[PDB]
Design a protein around this ligand. Structure first.
Ligand SMILES: CC(C)(COP(=O)(O)OP(=O)(O)OC[C@H]1O[C@@H](n2cnc3c(N)ncnc32)[C@H](O)[C@@H]1OP(=O)(O)O)[C@@H](O)C(=O)NCCC(=O)NCCSC(=O)c1ccc(O)cc1
Ligand SMILES: CC(C)(COP(=O)(O)OP(=O)(O)OC[C@H]1O[C@@H](n2cnc3c(N)ncnc32)[C@H](O)[C@@H]1OP(=O)(O)O)[C@@H](O)C(=O)NCCC(=O)NCCSC(=O)c1ccc(O)cc1
Ligand SMILES: CC(C)(COP(=O)(O)OP(=O)(O)OC[C@H]1O[C@@H](n2cnc3c(N)ncnc32)[C@H](O)[C@@H]1OP(=O)(O)O)[C@@H](O)C(=O)NCCC(=O)NCCSC(=O)c1ccc(O)cc1
Ligand SMILES: CC(C)(COP(=O)(O)OP(=O)(O)OC[C@H]1O[C@@H](n2cnc3c(N)ncnc32)[C@H](O)[C@@H]1OP(=O)(O)O)[C@@H](O)C(=O)NCCC(=O)NCCSC(=O)c1ccc(O)cc1
Lengths: 140, 140, 140, 140
């Protein structure tokens, strides 16, 4: 479907002693890409949404992650994001990370399908909401 | 099976603007717990292993993550680790995160089954190895 | 003066390819220790303070950092915190990090004096306030 | 002197509950900018240097940090790096972070002078070296 693409440079800080990306970092980039998607789709900043209709953002309730091959500093990553499926209060967000070999070949590094929702904070308690119609439409 | 348990305090740094743990952090704690397991099982530090038999550590090739309920700073987390299954070159490592309500009730926060391996770095290239026998035994 | 002490274990995630703590992590622990200080001194959680008298927390306006010797995973750090000086709207918070040699010797790893304040968020704008009297007193 | 410039986007992950950049993140970007400088100056990757002449990288022995004004997600940062002074085994690396107001005005966010060195790892022990001549020259 509607797919967004953002790039990400691997920094020395991002790798472990074994000298390859430390995994959590992928999550950090994913959460980035995630938001990036929606922004680039026309949804206002959370900051704003929380004031207009109480949406804080989109919490992750589930995720299936897969690490195909290693990466390291200097490598530049490409992250393909798209909405896999719209459920009721949930939605599938797929992201595919890859890197380029100097041969112009593109190698899948990692992939992940994260299941998120749009939520509100009724005080201290986080609560999911029915994916908003308008949202759908912008993302379309 | 053989299960290890370690605790983790949520720091203000660990939460987002929405005021709850930022997810990647869970991964960070998981990777911690992961290693903690093996250490507490008697395997020497990677540092050492890489010199004695070239093992750098245990890279993650797969993971299924689930966020049951929110957490925030000050909360103290309990992380239950264990080896779910030994395959050939792979192994299932399960971790269950929970927190305690002042009612002495324990609430599942998040869970994850990560699939890892023991590996070597043949130069620049990461390569998995057959789970080491002795390792098995210590973990038993 | 009134000094608080908290410990911190170095995780594999925390070190770089060079195999020693990655510096930013120190900051993370410092910010921890920082808050820890106040909590352990009796000040309620920010969460609370922001509702009772609008204090969000204590932003850092300045810091002088010094890295004496290296650290790495497995090492356990000890962080000594105390209020060096109370100014008007500012205050000096000193922290001294050290580790123990198996000889029972304690080696200074790193130190830092961070200058913070107590603040409010008048909408989008962050604003410092006169250190609160009561606070002083608890910290005393 | 020779000054390098790199940009950095603030991600939701990067901010705290108070809704502004969490400080350690600045350090992360600084360390980035730091390396970026040298790379863009023509020095090969550490990876390489450690094999050719044993240089692992450039550890930080000191830093003076200053936070002028707040930043938050979405903001795009500009980081100006340059070598302030070459000492013997040390060197001053200055970085100036700023952001742009929609008025086309540029506002200093934060600054820092970090004192680094070029080092080697004689086994487990980190040791500084005399800034390398050639390096100087490239950076010039
Ligand atoms: C979000 C929740 C409150 C939702 O609970 P509820 O309000 O009671 O409603 P529901 O249970 O019906 O959940 C709504 C949907 O999620 C689905 N869901 C819930 N759990 C699952 C799992 N495990 N798998 C698949 N789908 C799931 C559920 O089935 C619903 O789908 P629909 O049928 O289409 O309606 C609760 O699951 C929760 O709080 N989970 C923990 C959240 C958490 O800690 N996430 C990690 C931190 S958040 C974060 O990092 C972040 C970053 C950036 C952002 O923009 C936002 C958040
Ligand atoms: C690790 C690998 C080199 C293994 O490849 P190979 O050497 O060629 O062998 P194999 O393909 O046969 O994989 C070995 C096993 O993994 C299994 N595997 C591989 N992919 C999968 C997936 N996706 N699901 C399940 N099982 C899998 C595979 O089927 C084998 O199981 P066995 O049948 O029991 O042998 C390669 O998959 C790889 O490099 N993946 C990318 C690794 C990566 O980038 N991980 C993220 C960073 S590592 C990290 O954060 C870390 C932290 C702390 C540490 O201690 C270590 C590492
Ligand atoms: C905090 C500020 C709004 C204060 O500005 P103002 O409200 O206009 O008042 P002031 O300028 O008078 O500052 C108050 C005091 O700070 C002092 N100050 C300010 N800058 C400096 C520097 N550079 N050195 C020393 N002292 C300083 C100032 O001189 C005042 O001291 P007093 O004389 O005793 O009153 C503004 O400096 C600012 O926003 N700086 C940027 C803040 C920032 O981005 N910090 C990084 C992120 S915050 C963070 O990580 C965090 C973590 C955990 C928490 O609990 C809270 C925050
Ligand atoms: C680096 C050191 C081994 C140097 O010690 P030595 O080899 O014995 O030599 P020296 O003491 O003479 O230090 C060399 C220079 O540093 C100077 N130095 C040392 N401490 C200071 C302080 N506090 N202020 C100013 N200058 C200092 C020293 O005076 C020398 O300058 P010259 O006179 O010009 O020679 C030791 O100070 C050390 O290990 N400090 C701790 C290092 C540390 O833990 N840094 C944090 C983690 S590293 C990191 O995050 C990183 C990221 C990215 C990278 O590329 C590299 C590293």
């Amino acid at each position: 479907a509607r797919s967004i693409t953002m790039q990400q440079r691997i920094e020395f800080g991002d790798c472990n002693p074994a000298g390859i990306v430390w995994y959590p970092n992928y999550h950090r980039w994913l959460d980035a890409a995630s938001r990036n998607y929606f922004i680039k789709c026309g949804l206002p900043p959370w900051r704003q949404t929380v004031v207009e209709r109480g949406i804080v953002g989109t919490p992750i309730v589930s995720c299936n992650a897969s690490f195909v091959c290693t990466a390291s500093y200097d490598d530049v990553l490409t992250i393909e994001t798209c909405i896999k499926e719209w459920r009721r209060k949930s939605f599938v967000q797929r992201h595919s990370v890859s890197r380029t070999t100097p041969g112009g070949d593109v190698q899948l590094v990692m992939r992940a399908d994260e299941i998120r929702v749009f939520a509100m904070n009724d005080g201290e308690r986080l609560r999911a909401i029915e994916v908003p119609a308008d949202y759908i439409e912008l993302c379309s």
